[PDB]
Amino acid sequence: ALTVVGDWLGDARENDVFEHAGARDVIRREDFAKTGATTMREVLNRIPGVSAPENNGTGSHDLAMNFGIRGLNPRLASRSTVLMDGIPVPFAPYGQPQLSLAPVSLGNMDAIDVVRGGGAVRYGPQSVGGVVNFVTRAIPQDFGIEAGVEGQLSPTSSQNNPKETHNLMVGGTADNGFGTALLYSGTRGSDWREHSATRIDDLMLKSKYAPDEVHTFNSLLQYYDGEADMPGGLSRADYDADRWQSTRPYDRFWGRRKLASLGYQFQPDSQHKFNIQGFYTQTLRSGYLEQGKRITLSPRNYWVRGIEPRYSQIFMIGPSAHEVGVGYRYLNESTHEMRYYTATSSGQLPSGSSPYDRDTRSGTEAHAWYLDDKIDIGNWTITPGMRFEHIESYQNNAITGTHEEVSYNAPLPALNVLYHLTDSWNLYANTEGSFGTVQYSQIGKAVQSGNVEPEKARTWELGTRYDDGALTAEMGLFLINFNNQYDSNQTNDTVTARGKTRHTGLETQARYDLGTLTPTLDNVSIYASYAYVNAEIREKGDTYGNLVPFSPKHKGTLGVDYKPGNWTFNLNSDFQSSQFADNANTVKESADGSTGRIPGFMLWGARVAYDFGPQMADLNLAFGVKNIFDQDYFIRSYDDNNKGIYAGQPRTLYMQGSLKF
């Protein structure tokens, strides 16, 4: 019959994932709770090839997001394209993609779509680490209400405040076709570290209007507001004395985000689909930070506006089917950063009336177009594609009086192939171009060195996906060569130095219904995920041949789910090998705990849950434990002011409860 797929990202349709010509994994809301995940990182870590470290460094709190794909720097998740319903998550997607503030909450999501490969044509910038899309909860067809909550506590920690997460969903669609849903997610509390008190409020208003089967309008309004004290790292001496404490009393973070998104879809028939999405985000992220003999306050304001028209249509050319997709996005961002200060020796935090030694304004105007053709011929599905981006960014320093500008392009050609061995078995291969922008913080270096070219990456993937129903499995290999990185891999960064890293490995995961063997194991499912990742520094210099910091060569999960009747029993293990903290790959630990080998570890967790049924409105209850054996482990922050050792999550107890009307 030929139906146009169009947006394969969207709400992560099971079919689009299975047919995805490249590494892609989706964890749906239904599976979030099995490990007591309440944050993005916890679900993200369950995906092979993804590393989302515990809070640390500048992102030493829950409002930030830390994750790296395939050994890419996880600090503030700046190496992947982060989106929510296809909308840019960063307050400065291009100029400063560091998610010191990440206005997204797991509670408002129906799924987390991690597209490690095959997404560099339609999504960007910072596409080297693929695309990570947070799919928000779908609007119910007929009015329904859903509420859930999870509380956590680390008994062995000195930190007695629990961490509490709340989510509320109220929605439904009317006969006239107007649908709407209020999505609320909230976090209150502290984790296992002292000085981690957190408040997050994520309110979204989602609307859909389908007055017929051709016109469809959708809107997303969001108000995200949060604040959090930042634990920071400890020196080895302080860590040995008490690993829960914080020696960074002034470090605090807060930010808010206002988001308005408006979309329209025109689909006259099943062969043509037009979509136009518009959005505007206002962001304020500020924080107190102890820096040497001074305490600083860094208010940073961002404004982002974008409009993205897209069009898709399927047709035939001989025996092969062709689905052409074209898109364009105009994105504009404006920023204002200031740093107020006071002497740490003084007895006060900086304020708007304190002196300031930084007053800069930055902005970017980015134009991006993409074209791809999905060709179905026989058991094949070949999709060549190209993305091109023209970016203009500037940074005006009101104190030095300087104005810096950079203008550059990013041509990203791609090719992905899918082969259907059987109705339940696919093979894929692909290669694509991805890039990293010249960040505002790097413009000074960029213009001074005399080179303004973007950070370029070329990726290669080979894989397979299987699903006979009782068994789903996948395995893929990947190769990434990331060059011209403004952040060098040398111990001493110079204006001319440029980072270069190679990322190779294998990613695999499987799930098997042990029941399809012996009824003795009915409702028993076993699963595992594993990724071998070799991220190496290929930048000529003092660190050539060293391993990229914060990249475990081995990382994965294994678990078993047992669901007899209305019960659910989950057992899971998380493991990863050692990692380095600095480009020098210093084995010996520094006294300040900021550098030195970081041990690998294997954690175990379990959970018991019960679903009560239709009457007292699908009440679901669960109790679980993270890090059952209280395996001690830690991570380090190397370069930030609150660098040092960060105790890993100790044994943690949690409870979950949800209601559906």
Give an overview of the whole structure.
By secondary structure, this protein is mainly beta. It has two domains: 15-142, TonB-dependent receptor, plug domain (Ferric Hydroxamate Uptake Protein, Chain A, domain 1, Beta Complex); 143-661, Maltoporin, Chain A (Beta Barrel). 4% of the residues lie in helices and 54% in strands. The protein contains four helices and 32 strands. The chain has helices at 14-18, 40-44, 236-241, 440-449; strands spanning 24-28, 50-51, 68-69, 81-84, 87-88, 109-115, 131-136, 144-153, 163-173, 178-189, 198-209, 215-229, 252-269, 272-291, 294-297, 300-317, 320-343, 356-377, 380-397, 403-422, 425-436, 455-467, 471-485, 499-513, 524-537, 554-562, 567-576, 601-611, 620-626, 634-637, 644-647, 652-660. The strands form four sheets. It has a 23-stranded antiparallel sheet that branches. Strands 1-6-7-4-5 form a five-stranded mixed sheet. It is globular. A motif (TonB C-terminal box) lies at residues 644-661. GO terms for molecular function: siderophore-iron transmembrane transporter activity; signaling receptor activity.
